[model samples]
Target: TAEAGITGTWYNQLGSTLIVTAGADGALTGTYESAVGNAEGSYVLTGRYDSAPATDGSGTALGWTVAWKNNYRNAHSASTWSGQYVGGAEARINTQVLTTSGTTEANAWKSTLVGHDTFTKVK
Candidate 1:
């Protein structure tokens, strides 16, 4: 049940936060703040809310990517998150993320450790 849509400020337990605005045509624009290497500054996020069903079920499907500019460890790492917004007794955005730095095909080791995030809408 999508009691709540995917447009607002969401915070994760890991200290990452994002605020999103959904377009009428399913385009998404937002800002992301990280807890780790990319924690210092707010990075712009580019994504989309698709009309297709969420991979998780009834939730809306969404995805976003952030390009790191000031992070050292993630030196130019572009992290993308695939998500599903679920709403009911407990509303959350369940996401799976992948990381890739630079352009080397072999540099995609971060994907091997696909990460997960559950963000609760703050407002």
Candidate 2:
């Protein structure tokens, strides 16, 4: 069944890591590290969890909304990551990020993609 608790480190195929910690009343805070772009520091994200049903019909689904800023690029992103249990201590999450900037483009390809990533809980 889909179980609760997402307080741990999650890794993706691209080598990015998400370290999440739970707080009072379903509050969540975490740090996101980009593997491809370590020139900048890690991104800080904060949000909360909403109890919901899993899409896979396995167990309970954890829904979350988080926002982060790219310190190097001056771009900001808001994302939603929904987690579903995949057996054992692992969970799979689908993330969608929307990027935007208040300043001119530092790089031509900055914020080019919709920023979609699938993450699996590793610890």
Candidate 3:
């Protein structure tokens, strides 16, 4: 599976965009944008493939860990995750906790964020 160790793109609905590069050792490193139009900021993601299970009993599924963050407003806290490959050209589902900064009306509220992104081979 050459496709297993290549670069890829992941796009999410909550304005999260990422480009990941897989290493020869099965580790992944990448950068991501937190928000869409606002250009809120970026984060660094580091993950590795712990295991790849069969997705349809036909050997199409690949399981892996994909974590990311940039440390803005406690952004690093949202980093690190484990996901699975859903066959076709899509794989990996990331759930993040987005915490903002504030006081009283505290912008520092933490939201349990879920991002469903489709990953495609890019490199």
C-alpha displacement of 11 in model 3, angstroms?
0.3
**How would the candidate models be sorted by lDDT, starting from the highest?**
1, 2, 3
Candidate 2's displacement at residue 3, Å, is 8.7
* Model 2 residue-pair collision total: 1
The sequence of per-residue lDDT tens digits that candidate 3 reaches over residues 61-90 is 223332333344342334334454443454
Candidate 3: count of backbone clashes, pairs at least 3 residues apart or interchain:
9
Predicted model with the maximum lDDT: 1
Best by TM-score: 1
lDDT of 3: 0.47
TM-score of each: 0.78, 0.59, 0.51
Ranking by TM-score: 1, 2, 3
Q: Which digits, one per residue and each the tens of the lDDT, describe model 1 over residues 1-123?
A: 232266778898788888888776787788888887544768889898774555555778888998776443345678889988887657888999887666557655543336888898663
Query: Taking the tens digit of each residue's C-alpha lDDT, what string does model 2 give over 1-123?
Result: 222456777787788887777564566687877676322467776766543445654643444544445646433544455554343545566655444433356664664345676778763
The clash count for each model shown is: 0, 1, 9
Please report how far candidate 2 places residue 50 from its true position, in Å: 0.9
Regions of model 2 farther than 4 Å from truth? 1-4, 37-39, 52-89, 103-112
Candidate 2, residue 68: the lDDT equals 48
